[PDB]
Amino acid sequence: MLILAIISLITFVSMSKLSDNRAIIRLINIYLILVLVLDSFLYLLFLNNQTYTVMGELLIFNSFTFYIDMLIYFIMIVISSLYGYNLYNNNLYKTLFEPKKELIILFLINILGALLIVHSNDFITLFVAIELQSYSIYLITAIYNSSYKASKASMLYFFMGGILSILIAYSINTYYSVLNSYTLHSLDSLIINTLDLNLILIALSLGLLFKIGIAPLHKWLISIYENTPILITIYISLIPKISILSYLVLSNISINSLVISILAILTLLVGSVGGLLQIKIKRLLAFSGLTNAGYMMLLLLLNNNEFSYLYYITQYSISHLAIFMIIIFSIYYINYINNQYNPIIYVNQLKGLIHDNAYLVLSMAIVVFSFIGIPPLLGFFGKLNILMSILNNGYYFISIVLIVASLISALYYLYLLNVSIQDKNNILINSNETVSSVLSYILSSLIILITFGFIYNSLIIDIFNVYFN
């Protein structure tokens, strides 16, 4: 469906005027919803963990990739709604959030790149999908060319992504030179015992992981996330993380790797410690993303990581979307718009939000306490599954470090709630304006999922036991 959407959309966006952008985006939003609901029944193919190799052994289809695919569609639906609908109908918000003409096509193509990364069974397909996603994401960074910071960001991103892509291509070709093969499926226990592939496979893993910004190469990505338009940051900080991490989890090429162990430790420490002194909202959220990417990196050191990883990535996607949407909503109550790409920038600008919108702060509290991992919110069960996995496999020191990093990051998670439940002198008296029904309903759905997902935990594990065993 995705290819058909891309083709049609190119035709229409060519033949439509600049005023039709939001209507087009609503059209695609509904189309993706329709695909998600009508084609969901293809799950049935994956009963008993049945795996399918497709396209001449280039693509691999199993329950895991089907789930990642559905999750990516859900994320795309939510993200496209933010562009397809106005928060408010005033002039200010027409200036604040207007979709570019080609933005939707870039979004769909980057989604296609991500899905091809997930399904990749062969290194040529992996490299082509990586380059497709990398190019589309460069352009998404750069499409808002009136922003000085966005253009500077796109250029830095181009160069860092190019270097990491060259590292990846080098790793692929060294694997070819040693094994005369482009598939990991050719690998076996005998082959891993016989030959020392550790260097090559770790170089490939590192080349992929530095593209989502794990320490000690974080800062360039945090700067890019800071300097992009806020509705762009909601996307570019999420989809590449999902695709790359899912590919690495599915491939399992760094089991018990000492280098990945040390880098995951370092990423946890830097993500937790470095986010403490932050005063800008989006830099705080980017360091949050770094710490959570560390939590997921830990899962690359062990076999049978499917359940913990899927649960964690789903709850993280929901929490991330929700926190960005809350920051977006809280824009209507700020008294100073900093600029047209990033209306709110400093955490202190939320001060006293509870007096303007009590339930917005309720939602904020719920999402923050999910991030900290307070039961019975989803975040707690995500961390619980991760701890179960790593302790089952004897990563004791890493478990201690994970404890410590969650503690430390709770400080700058609660910074947001702290300033949000403080008091502001000028308190909204009244307003005729209504927030858009659709986005408020979506934000509410995310909040209710985070709050009451745990009631379905046992049902989920029962389903999982029949589709992934």
Partner 1 sequence: MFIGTIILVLSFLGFVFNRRNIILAFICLETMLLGINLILLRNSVLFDDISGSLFAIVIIILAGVESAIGLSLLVSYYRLRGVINS
Partner 2 sequence: MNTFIIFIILIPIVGFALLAVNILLAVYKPYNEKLGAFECGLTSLAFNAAFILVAILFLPFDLEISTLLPYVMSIYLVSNYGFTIVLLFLLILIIGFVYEINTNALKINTDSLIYKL
Partner 3 sequence: MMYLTYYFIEITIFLAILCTFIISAKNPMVSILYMIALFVIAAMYLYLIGLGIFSLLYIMIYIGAIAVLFLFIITLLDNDYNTIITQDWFNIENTTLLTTIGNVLLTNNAFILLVLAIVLLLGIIGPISITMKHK
Ligand X SMILES: CCCCC/C=C/C/C=C\CCCCCCCC(=O)O[C@H](COC(=O)CCCCCCCCCCCCCCC)COP(=O)([O-])OCC[N+](C)(C)C
Ligand Y SMILES: CCCCC/C=C/C/C=C/C/C=C\C/C=C\CCCC(=O)O[C@H](COC(=O)CCCCCCCCCCCCCCCCC)COP(=O)(O)O[C@@H]1[C@H](O)[C@H](O)[C@@H](O)[C@H](O)[C@H]1O
Write out the residues near ligand Y by the rule CB under 6 A.
163, 166-167, 170, 198-199, 202-203, 206, 256-259, 437-438, 441-442, 445
Q: Between residue 28 and residue 67, which ones bind partner 3 under the rule CB under 8 A?
A: 55-56, 58-59
| Stretch of 9-17, 77-85, 205-213, 248-256 lying at the interface with partner 2 (CB under 8 A) | 9-17
Q: Answer with the entry of ligand X, ligand Y, partner 3, none that 136 interacts with (C-beta below 5 to 8 A by kind).
A: partner 3
In the numeric block, which tokens belong to residue 345?
């920038």
CB neighbour list of residue 233: distance below 8 Å, 6 or more residues apart: 225, 282, 324
Nearer to ligand X by C-beta: 63 or 205?
63
Q: Between residue 165 and residue 184, which ones bind partner 1 under the rule CB under 8 A?
A: 166, 169-170, 172-173, 176-177, 180-182
CB of 302: closest distance to ligand Y in angstroms? 11
Instruction: Please provide the DSSP assignment of 186-229 as one string.
Output: T--HHHHHHS--HHHHHHHHHHHHTTTT-TTS-HHHHHHHHHS-
227 binds partner 3 (CB under 8 A): no
| Single-letter amino acid, residue 268 | L
Task: Give the CB-side neighbour count of residue 451, counting CA atoms within 13 A.
Answer: 11
SS3 assignment, position 395 = coil
CB of 47: closest distance to ligand X in angstroms? 8
- Is 160 within 8 Å of 222 (Cβ atoms)? no
127 binds partner 1 (CB under 8 A): yes
| Stretch of 120-128, 415-423, 431-439, 460-468 lying at the interface with partner 3 (CB under 8 A) | 120-128
CB neighbour list of residue 199: distance below 8 Å, 6 or more residues apart: none
In the numeric block, which tokens belong to residue 229?
């338009």
Nearer to ligand X by C-beta: 205 or 385?
385
CB of 282: closest distance to partner 3 in angstroms? 22
CB neighbour list of residue 465: distance below 8 Å, 6 or more residues apart: none
Whether residue 240 has a cis bond before it, omega within 30° of 0: no
Q: Answer with the entry of partner 3, ligand X, ligand Y, none that 203 interacts with (C-beta below 5 to 8 A by kind).
A: ligand Y
| CA dist 298 → 257, 408, 442, 461 (Å) | 10, 18, 31, 21
14 binds partner 2 (CB under 8 A): yes
| Single-letter amino acid, residue 341 | Y
CB of 134: closest distance to partner 1 in angstroms? 8
- Is 124 within 8 Å of 59 (Cβ atoms)? no
Nearer to ligand Y by C-beta: 199 or 407?
199
Residues forming the site for partner 1 (CB under 8 A): 123-124, 127-128, 131, 135, 138-139, 142, 145-146, 148, 151-152, 154-155, 158-159, 162-163, 166, 169-170, 172-173, 176-177, 180-182
